[PDB]
XYZ file of C-alpha atoms in Angstrom:
330
model
C -20.208 -11.411 2.589
C -16.935 -10.499 4.261
C -13.267 -11.444 4.017
C -10.378 -11.287 6.500
C -6.719 -11.970 5.703
C -3.489 -11.518 7.617
C -0.834 -9.309 6.074
C 2.816 -9.882 6.970
C 5.909 -7.683 6.589
C 8.323 -9.013 3.930
C 11.399 -8.151 6.003
C 12.648 -6.725 9.292
C 12.129 -3.127 8.095
C 8.464 -3.445 7.040
C 9.506 -2.505 3.482
C 6.193 -3.930 2.267
C 3.467 -6.348 3.342
C 2.238 -9.541 1.681
C -1.192 -11.092 1.931
C -2.067 -14.583 0.669
C -4.518 -14.674 -2.236
C -6.173 -17.724 -3.772
C -6.344 -17.686 -7.599
C -7.930 -20.298 -9.822
C -9.347 -23.793 -9.473
C -7.831 -25.655 -7.738
C -6.530 -22.721 -5.738
C -3.075 -21.362 -6.442
C -1.986 -19.289 -3.478
C 0.218 -16.283 -4.226
C 1.465 -13.675 -1.754
C 0.437 -10.267 -3.112
C 1.273 -6.707 -2.136
C -2.071 -5.008 -1.457
C -1.668 -1.534 -2.913
C -4.214 1.249 -2.287
C -2.141 3.428 -4.644
C -2.767 1.395 -7.820
C -5.558 -0.516 -9.483
C -4.102 -3.569 -11.246
C -4.095 -7.102 -9.870
C -1.045 -8.620 -11.543
C 0.971 -11.744 -10.862
C 4.188 -13.506 -11.669
C 3.121 -16.323 -13.960
C 4.034 -19.189 -16.242
C 4.222 -16.518 -18.956
C 6.814 -14.395 -17.159
C 10.215 -14.231 -18.897
C 12.156 -17.010 -17.162
C 15.244 -14.861 -16.485
C 13.010 -12.359 -14.639
C 11.674 -14.915 -12.163
C 13.875 -15.557 -9.098
C 12.031 -17.373 -6.315
C 8.487 -16.029 -6.705
C 5.476 -18.295 -6.767
C 3.830 -18.182 -10.183
C 0.251 -18.404 -11.385
C -0.198 -20.980 -14.130
C -3.529 -20.340 -15.844
C -3.372 -23.548 -17.882
C -3.723 -25.462 -14.587
C -6.857 -23.557 -13.587
C -10.188 -24.917 -14.819
C -11.811 -21.514 -14.294
C -9.184 -19.398 -16.103
C -10.187 -17.794 -19.393
C -7.974 -15.654 -21.620
C -9.387 -12.149 -21.894
C -8.872 -11.977 -25.625
C -6.885 -9.027 -26.912
C -6.330 -7.457 -23.500
C -2.916 -6.216 -22.441
C -1.626 -4.189 -19.532
C 1.443 -2.143 -18.697
C 2.160 -0.215 -15.518
C 4.924 1.948 -14.068
C 5.202 2.823 -10.385
C 6.545 5.826 -8.472
C 9.772 4.006 -7.625
C 10.525 3.535 -11.324
C 9.557 -0.133 -11.417
C 7.271 -1.604 -14.066
C 5.565 -4.701 -15.420
C 3.367 -5.727 -18.345
C 1.602 -8.680 -19.923
C -1.754 -10.147 -20.906
C -4.958 -10.860 -18.970
C -7.057 -13.773 -17.779
C -10.270 -13.800 -15.834
C -10.400 -16.284 -12.959
C -11.738 -16.849 -9.465
C -9.910 -14.872 -6.775
C -10.445 -15.232 -3.027
C -9.032 -13.141 -0.203
C -9.563 -14.347 3.358
C -12.763 -16.219 2.492
C -14.219 -13.563 0.171
C -14.606 -14.779 -3.406
C -14.883 -12.862 -6.685
C -15.584 -14.761 -9.890
C -14.476 -13.272 -13.202
C -11.736 -11.133 -11.668
C -9.175 -9.772 -14.106
C -5.847 -11.420 -13.264
C -3.082 -9.664 -15.135
C -0.358 -12.109 -16.058
C 3.144 -10.671 -16.253
C 5.180 -11.333 -19.368
C 7.817 -8.834 -18.238
C 8.774 -7.370 -14.869
C 11.513 -4.882 -14.020
C 14.555 -5.716 -11.967
C 13.236 -4.598 -8.588
C 10.355 -7.079 -8.844
C 12.658 -9.920 -9.888
C 15.002 -9.086 -7.016
C 12.228 -9.363 -4.431
C 11.465 -13.078 -4.077
C 8.802 -12.462 -1.420
C 6.286 -10.554 -3.574
C 4.406 -12.651 -6.143
C 2.444 -9.692 -7.533
C 0.250 -6.723 -6.605
C -3.444 -6.396 -5.754
C -4.571 -2.854 -6.479
C -7.130 -1.172 -4.260
C -7.204 2.380 -5.657
C -10.090 3.368 -7.937
C -10.709 1.354 -11.078
C -10.269 4.441 -13.249
C -6.487 3.890 -12.818
C -6.576 0.294 -14.121
C -4.183 -0.098 -17.061
C -5.896 -2.889 -19.019
C -6.451 -2.029 -22.669
C -8.637 -1.814 -24.679
C -11.236 -2.644 -22.023
C -10.403 -1.269 -18.572
C -10.966 -3.737 -15.742
C -12.281 -3.424 -12.190
C -10.329 -3.952 -8.975
C -11.030 -6.843 -6.640
C -12.752 -4.439 -4.222
C -14.889 -2.904 -6.973
C -16.003 -6.377 -8.092
C -16.745 -7.533 -4.508
C -18.404 -4.345 -3.294
C -22.034 -5.114 -4.084
C -21.794 -8.445 -2.253
C -20.117 -7.058 0.859
C -22.075 -6.509 4.075
C -20.761 -2.917 3.999
C -18.891 -1.373 1.035
C -15.603 -0.963 2.891
C -12.212 -2.471 3.429
C -9.820 -1.754 6.289
C -6.052 -1.751 6.610
C -4.498 -2.586 9.960
C -0.786 -2.816 9.270
C 1.595 -3.952 11.975
C 4.876 -2.461 13.135
C 7.423 -5.249 12.817
C 4.427 -7.614 13.129
C 1.536 -9.073 11.153
C -1.705 -7.173 10.663
C -4.993 -7.548 8.868
C -6.955 -6.540 5.786
C -10.711 -6.881 6.255
C -13.352 -6.583 3.556
C -16.978 -5.759 4.183
C -16.910 -4.966 7.893
C -15.294 -2.803 10.543
C -13.742 -4.764 13.437
C -14.617 -2.577 16.400
C -12.126 -4.489 18.583
C -9.181 -3.487 16.349
C -8.882 0.175 17.362
C -9.151 2.487 20.338
C -11.399 5.501 20.641
C -13.493 6.500 17.641
C -12.858 6.520 13.882
C -12.576 10.011 12.381
C -13.771 10.213 8.805
C -12.461 12.691 6.273
C -13.366 13.592 2.690
C -11.818 11.922 -0.338
C -11.216 13.216 -3.830
C -11.248 10.503 -6.474
C -10.292 12.909 -9.281
C -6.777 11.434 -9.626
C -7.958 7.861 -8.996
C -6.413 7.716 -5.516
C -7.662 7.723 -1.939
C -6.756 11.400 -1.796
C -7.513 13.408 1.332
C -6.344 16.466 3.277
C -4.581 16.226 6.601
C -5.214 19.123 8.975
C -1.602 19.492 10.135
C 1.292 18.040 12.065
C 3.437 18.050 15.159
C 7.020 16.951 15.747
C 7.624 15.082 18.979
C 6.103 16.925 21.929
C 5.974 20.151 19.929
C 2.915 22.261 19.266
C 0.547 21.246 16.502
C 0.783 23.263 13.290
C -2.579 23.710 11.587
C -1.985 23.462 7.864
C -3.717 21.592 5.036
C -1.676 18.764 3.520
C -3.259 17.045 0.513
C -2.002 13.494 0.050
C -2.875 9.887 -0.716
C -3.361 6.922 1.564
C -1.040 4.407 -0.104
C -0.407 0.978 1.408
C 1.961 0.223 -1.498
C 4.439 2.943 -0.569
C 6.804 2.205 2.326
C 7.550 5.695 3.640
C 5.821 8.972 4.494
C 6.417 11.645 1.840
C 5.504 15.187 2.860
C 6.315 18.768 1.800
C 9.932 19.863 2.206
C 9.017 22.401 4.899
C 7.380 19.731 7.082
C 10.196 17.231 6.555
C 12.866 19.845 7.370
C 11.046 20.717 10.589
C 11.019 17.040 11.605
C 14.679 16.259 10.889
C 15.871 19.516 12.493
C 14.947 17.840 15.795
C 17.424 14.981 15.242
C 21.048 15.798 15.957
C 23.203 15.040 12.944
C 20.354 14.448 10.498
C 20.851 15.728 6.999
C 19.530 15.408 3.479
C 21.971 13.403 1.394
C 21.801 13.754 -2.372
C 24.081 10.725 -2.766
C 21.892 8.479 -0.642
C 18.627 9.946 -1.947
C 17.035 11.495 1.121
C 17.338 12.285 4.794
C 19.724 10.180 6.819
C 20.469 10.299 10.531
C 22.936 8.809 13.012
C 21.881 5.252 13.850
C 22.653 6.160 17.482
C 19.717 8.621 17.584
C 16.420 8.264 19.382
C 13.838 9.619 16.944
C 10.956 11.880 17.932
C 7.399 10.958 17.121
C 5.445 12.566 14.285
C 1.779 13.482 14.596
C -0.599 14.068 11.682
C -4.097 15.536 11.833
C -7.280 13.899 10.635
C -9.918 16.546 11.118
C -9.785 17.411 14.814
C -8.216 14.024 15.609
C -4.532 13.129 15.796
C -2.535 10.056 14.772
C 0.855 9.616 16.446
C 3.657 7.811 14.609
C 6.181 6.649 17.208
C 9.778 7.599 16.529
C 10.849 3.973 16.113
C 8.516 3.644 13.095
C 10.618 6.269 11.297
C 13.899 4.262 11.539
C 14.662 2.338 8.329
C 18.074 1.169 9.414
C 21.560 1.427 7.976
C 21.869 2.873 4.482
C 24.136 -0.053 3.644
C 25.053 -3.091 5.671
C 27.172 -2.126 8.681
C 26.828 1.632 8.223
C 26.152 3.924 11.169
C 24.138 6.237 8.904
C 20.450 5.271 8.997
C 17.719 6.047 6.478
C 14.763 8.183 7.510
C 11.140 7.092 7.219
C 9.885 10.613 6.553
C 11.112 12.055 3.270
C 10.361 15.019 1.035
C 7.660 14.743 -1.620
C 9.212 17.584 -3.618
C 9.507 16.375 -7.194
C 7.084 13.455 -6.662
C 4.198 15.799 -7.355
C 2.041 14.399 -4.565
C 2.281 13.808 -0.813
C 2.074 10.139 0.158
C 0.794 8.725 3.445
C 2.573 5.403 3.022
C 3.030 2.508 5.435
C 5.010 4.572 7.986
C 1.871 6.643 8.573
C -0.822 4.060 7.924
C 0.619 1.419 10.266
C 0.133 3.852 13.179
C -3.625 3.720 12.565
C -6.623 1.577 11.842
C -7.673 2.832 8.412
C -11.123 2.566 6.819
C -11.358 2.769 3.042
C -15.041 3.561 2.648
C -16.256 2.816 -0.864
C -19.781 4.132 -0.391
C -21.300 6.189 -3.226
C -19.337 9.152 -1.889
C -16.092 7.567 -0.720
C -14.405 8.667 2.508
C -11.396 7.669 4.623
C -11.484 6.891 8.342
C -8.592 6.850 10.797
C -8.471 5.599 14.376
C -5.664 5.125 16.852
C -4.947 1.553 17.921
């Protein structure tokens, strides 16, 4: 089997991407944030505290003939941005772009933190990291990809995120028309439960490539590119007027600037992030100070190849017995 679904930016900045997901019988379609940095599939629901729902579409298990309470199971998750959610668990039928899993754990939110409530466009998350990170207790549950894998034509999914435009998540096949050149594959460590790999270096604009190992995670659920302070300083030093602002919470730059590109290495191959991808617009409405799309990972504890990086590539998440990551230009 295979699946193919379009993923769409939630706003004009590509702050996140939503992909329609069918849950239950008859189908209830929710727009979920596919997140390769976590491993819970959770949804706004009929059980969510009413004051914490503001415009999201909810899953109502009582209206699904295939929903079953997973007795005794609870979940609770916290994300790198400080947000969180928790609740109980059902199993139900879940389909993504024509690909169907029966008995998928659907984690129903009883509580969500303010940032989720405040984002009316995201109805929940669909985790695509390794199932060892799944928070369900006392019986850990598998991700949608883990459950589908055996049935897939090939044990892979691909992320093809757009810049200010829709893109695609495919399951079970590699669309050879979706990228240019060849796909370069690179080793993955699953020891922290992430799609963790090592970039071979970087360049700023038309500058020379610096060969240096940068361990990080491929994370579709993180908006920006978080890299070591040395790398980030080298980038922003090329932008007149750019500075790190403690009050804003990262590097800012004059909105009048033209940003240089940023290149990262994948083995001997190179992925180029155009400068425009690194512009996240005014820090506040009407400001001429703009927020940077490359930020320091210092104090995160891990480097994160978020959407800023991933959307410059066609990315293969290879879930073979020994997982690997592939990157191609597009």
